[PDB]
């Protein structure tokens, strides 16, 4: 239910997009804010991180921001 242009395949993503990301993630459920700039990377470094990473980056969100960029996975071919 993504920002138009996040519509792509996540390892398309610029920088720009994962900042646009959080934003929207952040306001869609119900998260604790976080610095917009936390994941300094793009989509390709994103889908390297593990969870673990990602809790480490956000320690009130990592968990479901990973779990939420899987699930945006699940969506195209």
């Given at each position: 239910r993504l920002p138009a242009h996040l519509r792509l395949q996540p390892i398309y993503w610029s920088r720009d997009d994962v900042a646009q990301w959080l934003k929207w993630a952040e306001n869609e459920f119900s998260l604790?804010?976080?610095?917009?700039?936390?994941?300094?990377?793009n989509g390709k470094a994103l889908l390297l991180l593990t969870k673990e990473d990602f809790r480490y980056r956000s320690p009130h969100s990592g968990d479901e921001l990973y779990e939420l960029l899987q699930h945006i996975l699940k969506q195209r071919e």
């Open positions: 604790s804010p976080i610095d917009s700039n936390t994941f300094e990377m």
